[PDB]
Design a binder for these strands. Structure first.
Ligand SMILES: [Ca+2]
Ligand SMILES: [Ca+2]
Length: 287
DNA sequence: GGTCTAAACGTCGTATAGGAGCATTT
DNA sequence: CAAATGCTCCTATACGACGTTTAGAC
């Protein structure tokens, strides 16, 4: 059985909290509904069934992508019990909090009033992309509810495993560089990318893993390039607390290249070619 | 001077997140 | 009816993932 913290982390990466407000058969003229969803590439449904098995709720689909969705009041109650017990720690937590207030309004059927509808619109206004042009036009001078800035340490190894399984990256960097014998440097790279709103979170993870540097481009990158930070810290970490989903295979290929660099012979033409073939067949070049 | 590692810097194209809205059941 | 939710399709930009140069150790 899959761990709950793996679930929260993975959701921290890939989930969405939504409120749909559609013109409508009804007295306020508007329909209000909450949605919670997690979406992945089609190849990873087994994770969803397992997660589904843990919570005992969610409806799964597989088409152009794979999604598990929670749309009924009871299932979202299951979702809320989960994230209340095993809380989110990225900025998406703030989205969660808006969703949760709205959900409760909806549970009490307060959404069927102009007053209640409007309060819900105040929650939706600060939720994700906020109010659409259509909704701004139909309901102007709306003041958006305040959104909590979440400011947080790593709760569990399985959380990191879920988050890296969504947003993490293992890639091989090849740089044209004449000062090297092969004409190329080979680097094993671990990376996490996140909007700057959570730099604190990134930093506790750096602290949590005892390695990596921050690169700022707004976006932030956690980047690990050091070979025996990679060897003696990152890989053992994801070795006891497993990366899940299709991304593991990339991780394994990443390990193989790390092994090749570790035996110091990636610095030969035959070896550099070898690593190149593997890199071109990992991550996006996989087809 | 040469070889190399670490990492600071640079940047593009699909893949997510987010969304919207009609159909069926409760 | 009307309220909830099942079901499916739409989209556009912030991560992924790829590439180059620099600081400097050995
Ligand atoms: Ca992802
Ligand atoms: Ca993301």
């Amino acid at each position: 059985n899959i761990s709950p913290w793996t679930i929260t982390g993975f959701a921290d990466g890939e989930s969405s909290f939504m409120l749909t407000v559609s013109k409508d058969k009804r007295n306020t003229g508007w329909s209000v509904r909450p949605r919670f969803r997690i979406g992945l590439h089609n190849k990873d449904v087994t994770i969803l069934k397992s997660i589904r098995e843990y919570l005992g709720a969610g409806i799964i689909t597989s088409d152009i992508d794979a999604r598990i969705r929670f749309e009924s009041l009871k299932e979202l109650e299951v979702v809320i019990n989960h994230f209340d017990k095993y809380p989110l720690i990225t900025q998406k937590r703030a989205d969660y909090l808006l969703f949760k207030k709205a959900f409760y309004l909806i549970k009490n059927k307060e959404h069927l009033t102009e007053e209640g509808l409007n309060q819900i619109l105040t929650l939706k206004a600060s939720l994700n992309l906020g109010l659409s042009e259509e909704l701004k036009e139909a309901f102007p001078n709306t003041i958006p509810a305040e959104r909590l800035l979440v400011t947080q340490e790593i709760p569990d190894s399985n959380w990191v495993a879920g988050f890296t399984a969504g947003e993490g990256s293992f890639y091989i960097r090849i740089a044209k560089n004449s000062t090297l014998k092969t004409g190329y440097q080979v680097q094993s790279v671990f990376q996490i990318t996140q909007d700057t709103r959570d730099i604190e979170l990134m930093k506790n993870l750096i602290s949590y893993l005892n390695c990596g540097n921050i690169r700022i481009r707004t976006c932030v990158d956690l980047v690990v390039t050091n070979l025996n930070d990679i060897k003696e810290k990152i890989i053992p970490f994801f070795n006891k607390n497993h990366i899940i989903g299709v991304k593991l295979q990339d991780y394994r290929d990443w390990c193989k290249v790390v092994t090749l660099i570790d035996n110091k012979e990636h610095l030969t033409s035959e070896g550099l070619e070898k690593i190149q073939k593997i890199k071109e067949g990992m991550n996006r070049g996989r087809s």
